[PDB]
Design a protein around this nucleic acid. Structure first.
Ligand SMILES: [Mg+2]
Ligand SMILES: [Mg+2]
Ligand SMILES: [Mg+2]
Ligand SMILES: [Mg+2]
Ligand SMILES: [Mg+2]
Ligand SMILES: [Mg+2]
Ligand SMILES: [Mg+2]
Ligand SMILES: [Mg+2]
Ligand SMILES: [Mg+2]
Ligand SMILES: [Mg+2]
Ligand SMILES: [Mg+2]
Ligand SMILES: [Mg+2]
Ligand SMILES: [Mg+2]
Ligand SMILES: [Mg+2]
Ligand SMILES: [Mg+2]
Ligand SMILES: [Mg+2]
Ligand SMILES: [Mg+2]
Ligand SMILES: [Mg+2]
Ligand SMILES: [Mg+2]
Ligand SMILES: [Mg+2]
Ligand SMILES: [Mg+2]
Lengths: 141, 78, 60, 150, 129, 259
RNA sequence: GGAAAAAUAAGUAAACCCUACCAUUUGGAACAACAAGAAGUCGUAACAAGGUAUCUGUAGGUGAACCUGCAGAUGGAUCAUUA
RNA sequence: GCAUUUGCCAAAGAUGUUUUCAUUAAUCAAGAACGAAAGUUAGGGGAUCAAAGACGAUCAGAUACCGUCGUAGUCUUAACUAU
RNA sequence: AUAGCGUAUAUUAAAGUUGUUGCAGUUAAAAAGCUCGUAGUUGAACUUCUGUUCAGGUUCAUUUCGAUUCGUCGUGUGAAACUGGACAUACGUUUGCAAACUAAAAUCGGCGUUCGACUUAGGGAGUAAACAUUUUACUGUGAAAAAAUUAGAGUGUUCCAGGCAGGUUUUAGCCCGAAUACAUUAGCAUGGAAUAAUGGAAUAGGACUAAGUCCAUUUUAUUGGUUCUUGGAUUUGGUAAU
RNA sequence: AUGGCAGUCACGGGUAACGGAGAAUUAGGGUUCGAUUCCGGAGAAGGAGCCUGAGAAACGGCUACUACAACUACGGUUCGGCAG
């Protein structure tokens, strides 16, 4: 036989074994350990915040570039956040102290290959979708 | 005092693995003096009104039986 | 199911009867096995659209 | 092959086909039963008695001839060897070990060997007790062994 | 030690047809081993077979036609309601054309199929195709 | 819970009422009466959705409140939106002299059987309990929650009586024993009518019974669900949906569309 | 004779305090610490028998990689030599 | 892990069995017996080799690979350590 | 892709990437250094096999028959197996019912007998209750609310979906509906022959049977005393391949 | 009198846990959810107490405490609790 036991009377055994050997899964181990609740958004999908300052960050390995980023202060959470401002002129709209809406970039964890320690995207300025501010015929204040 | 604990031995099925595990419920039983007890014998209880916190079963028919030692080890799908 | 299943005998027939009212299978195609060989192309042809046109009732 | 993850073979002994008693021999069950119990009285193991009846008085398989297994014959005739060969012997050497260990309180291979032998004895007790073939309060510890020594 | 000699005997046999043996000697044999055997025989998988009387527990010799593709047992012999059948038919059998999943019933031992006839079945035993 | 429930939900009201799912949200809750909640048909249901004499809700409010008295249940007047008309009852619609049997389908839906001034007289009663009470007197009780004084003594507890409503008189009873006809008031088998085969009591707390009928089908149900529709093959009342016998979904098709 | 305020004892026990303990969150600093990177700085450990080999354990020493003793394993730079 | 002779002490496989016993069994959390080196405590012992150390040489550098010496250990009794 | 389409996060599938089905474990991650060992898990083989005949379907086969058509039925054989019977040292016993035939005896008729009808005895078969160590497990039905899922009928303009609706040319009334299935786990009723566990006679004692004796006891109006029925206790003797 | 429970997991802890009916994807087996129309439970600011009644510890009733809401001529008052 193989490692696993094949008895009709040994269900219990197999059961406990699976519940145990199962902790070896990160996806499991992750949600199981209320880890999602401890991140900056507290599980949340999005978070409002105030711009603490627009800072720039350098690209990594084969890339060399000045990334646009805003240091934000989340509201009820109250944490320092590193937030990447999307497309071209974008940072030209973010005025310091305005209200911003941030969300993650591809599965909360690794930032885009290029960025260093940034885990967030900026989608709203004073409650005005960026895309909107990006295309003239849309909006501006 | 005129109260005994009977242990029932049954199997439980496990949906996934499609197999069973062992399990035992313990039961508070009242024994009228009439029948004579002994440890490790099969007994027949009836459903009588609550007589105490646990008790809710009275002995009605006793069968003497022999188990050489551990009553705990003993597990029979009786 | 067994070929003589109270269920099949009844639901099978009724399913077919419906393929007939909508004309997807021809009289001589009873057996369930045929319910499968049904082109989406065939079932598409039995639409008010596909019909009005194939009834020379339209230019296209 | 008992307590051995590695060693294992086949000693011998295969009862011949023909279930009847050998031709050449003539002995009402009773005739044997006498020898058996007589021999036994002298203080013999059903294990050893059978050996004689084969080596000495050409009786291959007492069971085949009597329709009775030695130990049974013996038990019916009061001549029952109290404690079974099985247990008896194991305990014997189990003990012999202890004596040797004493004057050689350092012989480790023997400490080990005894551990195995004492282990077996607990396996027989479990058994022989369950077949109500030995009082439940039986217990081999050191006193059960020295008890038989007297 | 040994267990489910039906399994002991069964694979010893498969190994036979698979190696191309002309016949097989199965050492530890039982009623079960034999019933299963006459069920394979009856369905035409194995050929004529003889049971030698080992004064202990018989030895059997089965002739090998050459049509056995595989014949094994199933680990613990789970219980199987008649409703649990397709599950196992699509599971064990290589097609909806060689239905041979031997089961044990109260009605004895029947072919995967016969159990639907008698309308009962119960615990799985083995399979052959 | 707070106290005692007092309403009823559309969704929760029995499938026996063949109710309007989309309907509203509630449904007239049966009033505490002769028959149990589930086993009953409140008048409002009986006229509105059943007969269809009424319609909107206020329609009833008129009928049962109108100083004319248009509804009779077992020779008595009733003016309660939800009087629980139960099994084997007799309802008369004054203004038209209509007489009905409160009986279950063969599919278990409450059906209204039309009676002739003849049967409208007798009603079938099943015996609940039987014991002697005050000052050496015998009392019998019927499912219909009837309490009887000085009843014939040859009546065992699980009996079935024929009642002459006109004289509030009994006549020809018949216990349940191997060889009679019966109606099953509730169960996975209600609405059926067959010949009692035998009654195996198990005392441990639940006795069972078997049955046969037209196409000689085998039926199984608990005694409490057996109502003796008659003694020795002859039924005592006209049954709805022909004879009390249901068809395979297969037999229904072949009978109707003949497949 | 009924009977309001008052007062009474045992009781249910709100809150509050003190004495221990649990759970869940959240906090904290210079120096320090950790993380990652490089054609920083010093040398060269390892691959090549990588100056006559790595490697495991344990022990001791050292700018650093590491060296060294005792015992192993080849994943070795041998599958081999009484005549 | 175990190789000088000889003598005791209890043990073991395999083979041989027409001997008994007749399921006594397979594996195993708990729970125990062992477990070269190196290392540790308190005594012995101390020939050889030798961590640390002292020196020569080699190197641009060598408290490293060679060489001269040398302490602990390496041997032992009784404890402990478990890789 | 399209009145929609991006994005963030948790979650399903791809995940045989948490694996009972269904993984891997020399070197890729992974056998513990090694043995003992109660829990746990797992356990060899034997106990009516088998044969003959009858019957009901079932299938399948068909150098074949009768019918019908746009695909079925009946008939015959062979065969298998099912079933169920019976019988064969062979899955039961009692009851009541029904009973089916036979062996005697009676009565009746013709000429003691040839024969016939009608009685007692007799078991199948035919039901219901009592028995076959106890469960597992499987069949089956009782129970498992409604809504939801599946699903029948049903042109809501199709459809979601509601459960309605169909024909005024019998219209102060007609026709038809609101079906059905699944529901595992634990409990109840119940059919059972396999596997599996469990059990019965080994100190002895058991079994069946007869008598004796002692204790206990129902109906006999009730209380005694006998007897007696009914349980239990022993002793003995008989029977059985103990 | 000294028991009752426990590795066939007691006792204790976590749960962004009220349980079901069910919901999403599904070859089979599974994986993840069920605050939320049905049912059952619990509660009405926290907590305890009670009147009344067939019936509630009710709470769109009352009493006191903790924290509060509304009016005041500051004496005192409120039919003051929107998880309808
Ligand atoms: Mg790259
Ligand atoms: Mg066991
Ligand atoms: Mg061997
Ligand atoms: Mg009312
Ligand atoms: Mg009762
Ligand atoms: Mg570097
Ligand atoms: Mg080293
Ligand atoms: Mg170090
Ligand atoms: Mg030498
Ligand atoms: Mg030690
Ligand atoms: Mg020293
Ligand atoms: Mg120089
Ligand atoms: Mg030196
Ligand atoms: Mg996309
Ligand atoms: Mg993963
Ligand atoms: Mg017989
Ligand atoms: Mg808790
Ligand atoms: Mg939950
Ligand atoms: Mg609710
Ligand atoms: Mg309740
Ligand atoms: Mg609101």
């Amino acid at each position: 036989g193989v490692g696993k036991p094949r008895g009709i009377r040994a269900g219990r055994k197999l059961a406990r074994h699976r519940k145990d050997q199962r902790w070896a899964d990160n996806d499991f181990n992750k949600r199981l350990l209320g880890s999602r609740w401890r991140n900056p958004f507290m599980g949340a999908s999005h978070a409002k915040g105030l711009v603490t300052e627009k800072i720039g960050i350098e690209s990594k390995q084969p890339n060399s570039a000045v990334r646009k980023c805003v240091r934000v202060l989340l509201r009820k959470n109250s944490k320092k956040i590193a937030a990447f401002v999307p497309m071209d002129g974008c940072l030209n709209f973010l005025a310091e102290n305005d209200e911003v809406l941030v969300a993650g970039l591809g599965r909360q964890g690794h930032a885009v290959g290029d960025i260093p320690g940034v885990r967030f995207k900026v989608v709203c300025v004073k409650g005005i979708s960026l895309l909107a501010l990006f295309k003239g015929k849309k909006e501006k204040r | 005092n005129r109260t005994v604990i009977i242990r029932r031995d049954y199997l439980h099925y496990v949906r996934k693995y499609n197999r069973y595990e062992k399990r035992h419920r313990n039961i508070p039983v009242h024994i009228s003096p009439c029948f004579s007890v002994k440890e490790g014998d099969i007994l027949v209880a009836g459903q009588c009104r609550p007589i105490s916190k646990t008790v809710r079963f009275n002995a009605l028919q006793v069968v003497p039986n022999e188990i050489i030692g551990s009553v705990r080890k003993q597990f029979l799908l009786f | 199911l067994d070929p003589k299943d109270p269920r099949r005998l009844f639901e099978g027939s009724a399913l077919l009867r419906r393929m007939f009212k909508y004309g997807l299978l021809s009289e001589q195609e009873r057996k369930l096995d045929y319910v499968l060989g049904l082109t989406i192309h065939k079932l598409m042809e039995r639409r008010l659209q596909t019909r009005v046109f194939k009834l020379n009732l339209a230019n296209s | 092959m008992q307590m051995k993850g590695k060693g294992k073979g086949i000693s011998g002994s295969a009862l011949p086909f023909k279930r009847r008693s050998p031709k050449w021999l003539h002995m009402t069950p009773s005739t044997v039963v006498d020898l058996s119990v007589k021999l036994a009285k002298k203080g013999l193991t059903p294990s050893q008695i059978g050996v004689i009846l084969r080596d000495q008085h050409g009786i291959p398989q007492v069971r085949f001839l009597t329709g009775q297994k030695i130990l049974r014959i013996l038990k019916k005739n009061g001549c029952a060897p109290q404690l079974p060969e099985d247990l008896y012997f194991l305990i014997k050497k189990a003990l012999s070990i202890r004596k040797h260990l004493e004057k050689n309180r350092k012989d480790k291979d023997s400490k080990y060997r005894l551990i195995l032998v004492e282990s077996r004895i607990h396996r027989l007790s479990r058994y022989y007790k369950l077949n109500q073939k030995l009082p439940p309060k039986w217990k081999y510890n050191a006193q059960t062994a020295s008890a038989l020594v007297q | 030690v040994k267990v489910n000699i039906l399994a002991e005997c069964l694979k010893d046999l498969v190994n036979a047809e698979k190696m191309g043996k002309k016949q097989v000697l199965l050492r530890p044999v039982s009623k079960v081993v034999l019933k299963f055997l006459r069920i394979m025989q009856k369905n035409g998988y194995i050929g004529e077979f003889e049971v030698i009387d080992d004064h202990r527990s018989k030895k059997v010799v089965v002739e090998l036609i050459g049509r056995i593709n595989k014949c094994g047992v199933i680990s613990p012999r789970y219980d199987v309601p008649l409703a649990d059948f397709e599950k196992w038919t699509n599971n064990i059998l290589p097609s909806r054309q060689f239905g041979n999943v031997v089961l044990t019933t109260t009605y004895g031992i029947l072919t995967h199929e016969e159990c639907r006839k008698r309308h009962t079945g119960g615990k799985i035993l083995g399979f052959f195709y | 819970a707070r106290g005692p429930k007092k309403h009823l939900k559309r969704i929760n009201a029995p499938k026996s009422w063949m109710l309007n799912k989309l309907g509203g949200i509630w449904a007239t809750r049966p009033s505490q009466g002769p028959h149990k909640l589930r086993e009953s048909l409140p008048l409002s249901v009986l006229l509105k959705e059943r007969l269809n004499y009424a319609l909107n809700g206020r329609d009833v409010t008129l009928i049962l409140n109108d100083k004319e008295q248009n509804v009779f249940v077992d020779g008595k007047v009733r003016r309660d939106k939800g009087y629980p008309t139960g099994l084997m009852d007799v309802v008369r619609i004054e203004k038209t002299d209509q007489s009905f049997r409160i009986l279950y389908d063969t599919k278990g839906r409450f059906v209204l059987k039309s009676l002739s001034k003849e049967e409208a007289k007798y009603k079938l009663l099943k015996v609940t309990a039987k014991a002697i009470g005050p000052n050496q007197i015998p009392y019998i009780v019927t499912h219909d929650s009837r309490t009887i004084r000085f009843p014939n003594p040859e009546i065992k507890i699980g009996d079935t009586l024929k009642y002459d409503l006109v004289n509030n008189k009994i006549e020809n009873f018949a216990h349940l024993e191997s060889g009679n006809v019966c109606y099953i008031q509730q169960g996975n088998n209600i609405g059926r009518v067959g010949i009692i085969q035998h009654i195996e009591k198990h005392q441990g707390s639940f006795d069972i019974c078997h049955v046969k009928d037209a196409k000689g089908n085998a039926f199984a149900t608990r005694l409490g669900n057996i109502f003796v529709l008659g003694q020795g093959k002859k039924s005592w009342i006209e049954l709805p949906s022909g004879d009390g016998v249901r068809e395979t979904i297969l037999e229904e098709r072949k009978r109707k569309f003949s497949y």
